[PDB]
Design a binder for this molecule. Structure first.
Ligand SMILES: *[C@]1(O)CO[C@@H]2[C@H](C#C)CN(C(=O)[C@H](CC(C)C)NC(=O)c3ccc(-c4nc(N5CCN(C)CC5)sc4F)cc3)[C@@H]21
Length: 217
């Protein structure tokens, strides 16, 4: 069974508005909540902002504003038996004491799956079947950071230099250039209303399929 040629989970109401992480190195936490928000919508029919601050403060196997992995975040939610809503545990952009409150719990996690390393076909199939998928990329180039439009490709991107965590919310094509639809956490003023289209099936450009995972619930 082949997946659809294009998919956009924003059209299905799976994707919350674009957030701004500020100076804190919490990309991993926004990536993780985005993937959880998608699964929560699929489960309950309700689209709700989940708490990246809950993750920043409480995932002891991560480094708060110094960075983290999404898989560690999913493990925390699984162990903790929940994650709070944004409303119950708001974002402040600095690491603080863990103040998780189970009465504000808005989602749970049964585990996570990792996409086979470097496999863009497997990533495509996972996005199609599951929903938004957490991904890591090389976002270090100024060409990435100044993105405004089109399908982003830069030969200098290094798939071994994973330095940013974002969310793949779909995939498709523009002017014949296959792409991934990527939600960033640098605010709506960045990119195209907070989004970037990144080259798809161009030899795993920017490491898009090197550290991709999604939560189960
Ligand atoms: C994002 O916001 C983007 O910029 C900053 C960083 C820079 C520059 C890179 N960032 C990250 O979060 C990356 C994301 C990956 C997916 C590419 N991750 C890390 O930088 C990172 C991962 C994991 C850890 C980590 N620390 C642990 N410690 C901390 C010390 N403590 C005493 C014990 C536990 S466990 C662990 F997995 C740190 C950083 C952001």
């Amino acid at each position: 069974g082949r997946a659809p040629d294009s998919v956009d989970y924003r059209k299905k109401g799976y994707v919350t508005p674009v957030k701004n992480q500020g100076q804190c190195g919490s990309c991993w936490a926004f990536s993780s909540v985005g993937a959880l928000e998608g699964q929560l919508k699929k489960k309950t029919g309700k689209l709700l902002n989940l708490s990246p601050q809950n993750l920043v403060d409480c995932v002891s196997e991560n480094d708060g504003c110094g960075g983290g992995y999404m898989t560690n975040a999913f493990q925390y939610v699984q162990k903790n038996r929940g994650i709070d809503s944004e409303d119950a545990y708001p974002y402040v952009g600095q690491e603080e004491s863990c103040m998780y409150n189970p009465t504000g719990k808005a989602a749970k996690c049964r585990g996570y799956r990792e996409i086979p390393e470097g496999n863009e076909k497997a990533l495509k199939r996972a996005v199609a079947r599951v929903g938004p998928v957490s991904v890591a990329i090389d976002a270090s180039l100024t060409s990435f950071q100044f993105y405004s439009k089109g399908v982003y490709y830069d030969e200098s991107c290094n798939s071994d230099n994973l330095n940013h965590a974002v969310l793949a919310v779909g995939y498709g094509i523009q002017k014949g250039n296959k792409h991934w639809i990527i939600k960033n956490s640098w605010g709506e003023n960045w990119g195209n209303k907070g989004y970037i289209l990144m080259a798809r099936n161009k030899n795993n450009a920017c490491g898009i399929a090197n550290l991709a995972s999604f939560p189960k619930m």
